[PDB]
């Protein structure tokens, strides 16, 4: 029921321990095509493989990679790492923009954009048989611009036609997440199929709860990126939200400084502060299972 | 020994010949095409590329300047794959086509870092091919001159000083963006006659077109066939008005071709029209030969 990169599908029950938001590799499609002398596919590949290998050491079974248009999605690269590690990797479709769309989308309808997403879900991605397993959309400081709203509505339509869930990028300080959730549910999207991301960058604990209360997963997913909020402020927001019994809605990731910083810092901090392996299992196993259920 | 070419060796800026200064063999969004290749068809775009190039050589075009850059799908492998089938003098370029923001890769990065990336295309080559870049292409439009748009403008000027190359721009004829690019590049001390300000033929406000021409810069009447911005006869009215008002030395004409829109509509219409309205053969040589020669000298 969940498509995978270079494997057969899996039942949502078998997803296992999951990191819900990690980037194997991410870049601007335009910058790379026009100046490859700034990149190297040799170092990029090895670091992907070894980081994943470590992640499999610590017990990570499944990785969800929300690299889409605007972030350099390459399914050929993804089927490489799957070959070299055997990891369960979920790829998605969608559009990552903050203001306007590429000039190609001038005079194109929302149903024209959803077709692209529905194409990646039903037929495959970039020619390969790898199919999308979720849609990814984004909003930030500019808030909900009109092209950003076109993208949100194109995701709601793909969700209703394929029932794959939606991951969002948002800005924690300007209400974009709540607006994403408001527009998506209005269009019929089940709240439980929505992950509002990048809420770790805030401490307005009542804003986070307002999103969780409406039935969507909340993203505490920017560890290691210590330029937004220090980790030991993130770990207290997480713990606070866990002490209030919100672990059924909490989702934690790195947004990738390494892809094991949670096993080194986050999880050990939490287990020292009370949370049993039930809470840890709710966040990294059961919540991903409902999200793809 | 001056103007690099795609699939060929360098020529002097006075062997340039009959130039179409602004044409696109192909244009697309790198981000859209990399993600949804089922939308495109390289083979059809190869046949149409070659068809229209050689048919422009039938009418005597010797050189086509192509300002397809970052944001417009520049691909020198496709370019020299068309040169091999036509023998055209193709001038590739470097630069950044944006209207609001730069890609996130450029976040916190510096004006000189961007300029270093144009100079890599000019001095070392483009996309790891031995094809170099003969000019810098920058852009502005309806969003106005914004912060990152202004950083690419100045990044271009810095490539002008070091490399010498001229600078083709894309503006919006209806909001003084073209003038502001000139106001910014020259206030940065670039040779005004090394700036071609583009798409001025989209308006019939002659006074605005002349103010840019008077300040020393080439004006671009370069979207022939695109009737959504201005119909053809209304463009022939403006081009003629500008010729008979003295400005033939700072006029450049092209199609910007990526109704009756092709890459030879000026030979099928505009040039017969101008001849029968008092334009002799030496002024059309000024427009398609002399003005290019100077731009690249
Ligand atoms: Co993100
Ligand atoms: Co243009
Ligand atoms: Fe991300
Ligand atoms: Fe153009």
Numbering used by the authors:
A (entry chain A): 2 to 257, 278 to 314
B (entry chain B): 1 to 258, 276 to 314
Extract from the study:
Phosphotriesterase-like Lactonases (PLLs) are appealing candidates, being natural lactonases endowed with promiscuous phosphotriesterase activity. PTEs and PLLs belong to the amidohydrolase superfamily, and share the same (β/α)8 barrel topology. SsoPox exhibits high acyl-homoserine lactones and oxo-lactones hydrolysis abilities, and promiscuous, low phosphotriesterase activity. SsoPox is a very appealing candidate for the bioremediation of phosphotriesters because of its unique thermal stability, and its ability to resist aging, solvent and protease treatments.
αsB5 (V27A-I76T-Y97W-Y99F-L130P-L226V) is the only selected mutant that does not contain a substitution of position W263. In the two other mutants, αsD6 and αsB5, loop 8 could not be modeled due to the lack of electronic density, which was likely to be due to the high level of motion of this enzyme region. Analysis of the normalized thermal motion B-factor supports this hypothesis. Structures reveal that αsB5 mutations have a destabilizing effect on loop 8, as illustrated by the B factor analysis. The two selected variants, namely αsB5 and αsD6, which lost the thiono-effect have only two mutations in common: V27A and Y97W. Both residues are located relatively close to the bi-metallic active site, yet do not interact directly with the metals (V27-Fe: 6.7 Å, Y97-Co: 4.3 Å). Because W263 substitutions were previously shown to be key for increasing SsoPox’s phosphotriesterase activity, we used saturation mutagenesis to introduce W263 mutations to the background of αsB5. The best selected mutants against paraoxon were found to be αsB5-W263I/L/M. Surprisingly, none of these mutants demonstrated an increase in phosphotriesterase activity in comparison with αsB5, but rather a decrease in activity. For example, with ethyl-paraoxon as a substrate, W263M and αsB5 produce a catalytic efficiency improvement of 14 and 67-fold, respectively, while the combination αsB5-W263M increases activity only 11-fold. The destabilizing effect of these mutations can also be observed on the overall enzyme stability, with αsB5, W263M, αsB5-W263M exhibiting Tm values of 70.4 °C, 85.3 °C and 69.1 °C, respectively, as compared to 106 °C for the wt enzyme.
